[PDB]
Amino acid sequence: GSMKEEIKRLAEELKEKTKNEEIKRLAEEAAELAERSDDPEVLEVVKKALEEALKSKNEEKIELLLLVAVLVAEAGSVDAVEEKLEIALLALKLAEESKDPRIIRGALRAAIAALRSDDPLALKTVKEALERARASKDERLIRAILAAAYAFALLAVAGASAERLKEAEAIVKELIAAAEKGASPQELVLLVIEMMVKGMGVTMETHRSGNEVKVVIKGLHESQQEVLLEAVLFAAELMGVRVRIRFKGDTVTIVVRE
């Protein structure tokens, strides 16, 4: 009721204060989701998150607060899907018990993307990835699990077919298994690239020099290049890997530096 109009005003103040477009988008959907929610406990959380976001200037913490508001408003009350509430709780518990902000960002992003996909394969993959991350305290392993879970959920949100999503699932297993063996973060980023390539049905060429590992992806169009870039850049930021991006027409060139 009264909180919904206050949430819209608080979300408007954040949009005008900051210039980060991702913060402005998160503030937008936080106001949209809150207006469609009648639960008072949901509205008080997203308003409490928006108020603390206005008390801060650090864009990394404002994004995290906004991600909590989006996830809770997406599935944080009764009359929501029981499986969506489980995934929301797993990401919130994993984020509360972690120190690295990239683990907090990855856990919330992966959960939000899985709920919006409405795909049963994406819901179970992210659910099992969050439980696997909670079972260990290896922050380096947790960051690789969340990067793979988020990129896989993006494929479902983007509308990947069941056949291509299944091939992408086999790479999710391979990436997680390779992270538990201590594989370098560069090879884990290369696996994210391969996951998105098979998930969208295109091809890739890998030219390995040992120093400049370059991947050339052909046949991608506008929406596909945005989804691929969002998944790979998110993984690189969580793994601490420097990546160079170049696109031209329907081709995307990705260089993974150590």
Binding site: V45, E96, I104
Partner: peptide
């Protein structure tokens, strides 16, 4: 169960927000 799951979501989210609020 949905009521109990929703309660844990609100409780955990409130603690996560105060956690991000204290740390800078």
């Amino acid at each position: 169960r949905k009521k109990e799951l929703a309660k844990e979501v609100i409780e955990t989210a409130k603690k996560l927000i105060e956690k991000l609020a204290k740390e800078e």
